[PDB]
Design a protein around this ligand. Structure first.
Ligand SMILES: O=C(O)CNC(=O)C(=O)O
Ligand SMILES: [Mg+2]
Ligand code: NI
Ligand SMILES: [Zn+2]
Length: 331
């Protein structure tokens, strides 16, 4: 078995190898990449997502989210308080302010220490989940707005034609902005490209060990666990590496820099934080190997996780017994 220790793998495709996205994902899996839950892909040196970022300041962040934490430094939840709209230019200025900017630090490790020590005491503002793309339409390779759609994968594999569309999302981050422990909707893959700015640190649990993280999470967030059988779908809980190590949970960490792609694999729990002002683009995707994970994916039926139009059809076709109760949560 390849990659038996479930290490995060880093790939350096040539421009030739960068032409066929599906084929490259299947190659990475042939090398065991999916066992980690997360892989890094460094694009060929000739490739660019677009010519410049010089004219992005007029993008609107219609609902910036202030991420308020509760709990202790290593075990906390975050709630998102909606803020008034602002442009990316306004947000970047805010991120660079004395109140919100990245502190002095020695290296990524010192910064990671400072994030875990101090996150809970601040409420950074995240411009998350903005429909749109920053790929130039002329970028033909690994353009996250031109991928094959999940509906078309399901149709090719299973023969069933369903409604729904699949489009990317922009994320504008600042120091301490945080993504909580989660897998993707329907345990899909994700791909994330860091367009610009400061890095993003990721933590990931191998898919084969995901249930170990869930059992820890039920112990650490016991009222949340009683409220919902899949409360990590709410995307609110954080657990530090120190706490994961204390409790024997297998995980790995890696820092993504501007110009790099990350792939998360089905049922690969991930969490992380931004080092400073940045912009990422991400989208879900599927492969034939995903179908079985989609059939087995947990679902929030408490009503908190409240997800897309397109997830309806996935539930309806892959999880018909759940269908009924899950849509009671979503209506
Ligand atoms: O970048 C972030 O805030 C969150 N991204 C992801 O969880 C992803 O790409 O799957
Ligand atoms: Mg603009
Ligand atoms: Ni994700
Ligand atoms: Zn729920």
């Amino acid at each position: 078995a390849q990659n038996p220790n479930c290490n995060i793998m880093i790939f350096h495709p040539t421009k030739e190898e960068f032409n066929d996205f599906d084929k490259y994902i299947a190659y990475m899996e042939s090398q065991g990449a999916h066992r980690a839950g997360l892989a890094k892909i460094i694009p060929p040196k000739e490739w660019k997502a677009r010519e410049t970022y010089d004219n992005i300041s007029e993008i609107l962040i219609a609902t910036p989210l202030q991420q308020v934490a509760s709990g202790r430094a290593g075990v906390f939840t975050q709630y998102h308080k909606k803020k008034k709209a602002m442009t990316v230019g306004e947000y970047r200025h805010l991120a660079n302010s004395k109140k919100y900017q990245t502190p002095p630090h020695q290296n990524f490790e010192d910064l990671e220490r400072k994030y875990w020590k101090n996150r809970i005491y601040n409420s950074p503002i995240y411009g998350a989940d903005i429909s749109g793309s920053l790929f130039d339409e002329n970028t033909k390779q690994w353009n996250l707005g031109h991928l094959g759609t999940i509906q078309d994968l399901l149709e090719k594999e299973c023969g069933v034609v369903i409604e729904g569309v699949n489009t990317p999302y922009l994320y504008f981050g600042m120091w301490k902005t945080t993504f909580a422990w989660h897998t993707e909707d329907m345990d899909l893959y994700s791909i994330n490209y860091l367009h610009l700015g400061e890095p993003k640190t990721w933590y990931v649990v191998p898919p084969e060990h995901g249930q170990r993280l869930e059992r820890l999470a039920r112990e650490l967030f016991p009222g949340s666990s009683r409220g919902c059988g899949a409360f990590l779908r709410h995307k609110v809980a954080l657990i530090s590496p120190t706490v994961l190590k204390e409790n024997g949970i297998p995980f790995n960490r890696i820092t993504q820099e501007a110009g790099e792609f990350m792939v998360t694999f089905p049922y690969g729990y991930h969490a992380g934080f931004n080092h400073g002002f940045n912009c990422a683009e991400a989208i879900n995707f599927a492969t034939p190997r995903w179908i079985d994970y989609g059939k087995m994916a947990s679902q929030c039926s408490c009503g908190e996780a409240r997800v897309t139009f397109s997830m309806d059809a996935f539930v309806r076709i892959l999880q018909p017994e759940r269908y009924d109760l899950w849509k009671r949560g979503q209506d």
